[PDB]
């Protein structure tokens, strides 16, 4: 297989790098696409180093197999057209294509097949946050289907990129030192504060990222479940958590989803409390699976469960996830 | 009113002195007592200095018309007879009284009047997470009744008292110096993490944090509302936030909602998402009141109202509500 990696220089395109090495994809040759900004960086991978090119509307994707894209929704928008020009699988990370019929939206533990029809070949990566919660949902759907969500996001600096990640630093090491807490890449301070505003507001006064959670969520689990989320910015570095109540069509008692998740594919099953053992984003860091915990019956609906889930944004929220489309298709024999 | 003060070393205590000056409470004699430790101490009260006295099984409180008790719930069970022998009102800040029928749990925005009726002379103070959330949730209950809630709590590290906050800004100076951090007096490190877990567990795997928030609700709302709680301790100094779903039996929209949290005494509304205004616990530290915002409508539910607030954990959520319960009752004529 031949693989560009469109915006190789961020954190997402950097863990594309990981990934592919980590888990031995199958690679002939690889081509690294960004701006003009990191046009003639040098990166090495897998003994060969390789220079970025900068990303022109030509014919630099005759035959690349694969295009990974986590450049931004006006690049994929943009240069789909370049990508796909030469019948190249374009796998974006970027929110452009998420809501169009023809595009699939893929979470390959849920929708896989999705995956197999791509009419303007291009297969969108969901949301960071979407990801995380239906890889947790979908072992919960096959016990009884899933009628409503209420989920409250505990999301990294992270999700801002890797400039969000270095202001939440900077600004650890600026209260340690009496100084002043430097603001841009937020809103207000995140060091010591919660900011509950993920992305701008839409006309129902929810953000574009509590939208996402809703829309998106439908499409991927082919399901008219009714998601309704609290998006909040939390001084931590690199994994979401999002405490979620499920409301089914018949009550599922814990042990039954404990037995449930401990099956799932994408999941791991972290729920002790007499040993304090439940899912913490500071130890789901650069780690693989979506992690649950504090499983208990809903109080408040003989319906419901309770539960605490946490995964790494750059790893299955983005980078991974889109290395396990393509890895699928190709046991599909797709390629 | 001669006031005493019981376990005054403390964060609570200290802030009792703190709300009885700012609020110019009628006071004529003040008496703070402590353990054997803090007994000797001085401290400043109004331009007079006072000296602790140990706290004993005597008749010290004689004449004292009423004691603010922050001192442990073992110590208040222990001197709870003491400490009302002669007459004197007990407003407890405790746990040990918050489920005994006969004292009544208050606060004074909800249920004020139930301090009017204390047969043991002991009135307790609600839990901090609590005493938030009703005062946000009664202007709605007074539209509609409310049958379930959904919380997901982000709550500051002073939940675990002065040392709690010392051990959050001591591991931002160690992570600052890339030094080992400091984890004593919570289960993990806090810092760049997130802690799902408040207090022990309990047999059906909610902790007691959450549990109080289940049966306090109860009994300051006099209502058979379910609430649901996730708690999760937050690298956040001294400001507690909720994310709510509220369920009432006819629908509530948003501009409804907001119009009662406008009026309603105890809240501020804080909610203009074009501005980016909305409550933040940096900036809801050291305030009064229980500030409220991102409202809007449940998308998960016709008859679901969605909102965020914030509140200070130390003053409305302990002293200053404890000082309200008494400032109530002298409105009423009650000394
Ligand atoms: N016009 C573009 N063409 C290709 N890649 C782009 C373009 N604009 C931005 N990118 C890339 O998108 C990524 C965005 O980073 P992040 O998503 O972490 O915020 C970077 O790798 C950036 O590369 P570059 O360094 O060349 O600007
Ligand atoms: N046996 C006791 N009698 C009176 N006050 C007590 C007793 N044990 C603890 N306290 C007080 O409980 C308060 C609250 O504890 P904290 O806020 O530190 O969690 C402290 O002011 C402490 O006072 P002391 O300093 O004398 O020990």
Redesign the interface.
């Given at each position: 297989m031949k693989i560009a990696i469109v915006g190789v220089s961020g954190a997402v395109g950097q863990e594309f790098l990981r990934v592919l090495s980590q888990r031995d994809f199958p690679i002939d040759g690889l081509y690294l696409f960004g701006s003009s900004r990191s046009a003639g960086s040098v990166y090495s991978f897998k003994g060969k180093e390789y220079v970025v090119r900068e990303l022109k509307d030509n014919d630099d994707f005759k035959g690349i197999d694969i295009a990974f894209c986590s450049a931004g929704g006006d690049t994929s928008i943009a240069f789909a057209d370049t990508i796909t020009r030469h019948g190249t699988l374009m796998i974006d990370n970027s929110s452009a294509f998420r809501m169009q019929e023809d595009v699939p939206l893929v979470v390959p533990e849920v929708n896989g097949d999705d995956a197999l029809v791509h009419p303007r070949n291009i297969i969108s990566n969901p949301n960071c946050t979407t990801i995380q919660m239906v890889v947790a949902l979908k072992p919960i759907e096959d016990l009884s289907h899933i009628r409503?969500?209420?989920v409250?996001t505990?999301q990294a600096a992270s999700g801002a990129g890797a400039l969000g990640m270095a202001e939440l630093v900077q600004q650890?090491?600026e209260?340690?030192?009496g100084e002043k807490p430097t603001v841009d890449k937020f809103?207000?301070?995140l060091?010591?504060?919660?900011?509950?505003?993920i992305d701008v507001?839409t006309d129902?006064?929810?953000t574009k990222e509590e939208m996402k959670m809703?829309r998106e969520t439908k499409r991927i689990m082919h399901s008219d479940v009714?998601?309704?989320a609290?998006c909040?910015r939390?001084?931590?570095?690199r994994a979401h958590?999002e405490?979620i109540?499920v409301?089914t069509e018949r009550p599922i008692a814990?042990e039954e989803a404990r037995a449930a998740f401990a099956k799932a594919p994408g999941v791991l099953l972290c729920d002790e409390?007499?040993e304090?053992q439940?899912?913490?984003?500071?130890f789901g860091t650069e780690q693989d699976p979506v992690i649950v915990?504090?499983?208990?019956?809903?109080?408040?609906?003989p319906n419901?469960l309770?539960f605490?889930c946490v995964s790494d944004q750059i790893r299955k929220g983005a980078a991974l996830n889109a290395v396990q489309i393509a890895e699928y298709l190709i046991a599909k024999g797709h390629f």
């Open positions: 409503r969500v209420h409250a505990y650890v090491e209260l340690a030192r809103a207000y301070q060091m010591y504060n919660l900011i509950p505003q507001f129902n006064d929810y809703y009714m998601v309704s609290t909040v939390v001084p931590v570095m958590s405490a109540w409301e814990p409390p007499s304090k439940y899912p913490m984003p500071l915990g504090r499983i208990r019956q809903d109080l408040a609906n419901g309770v605490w």
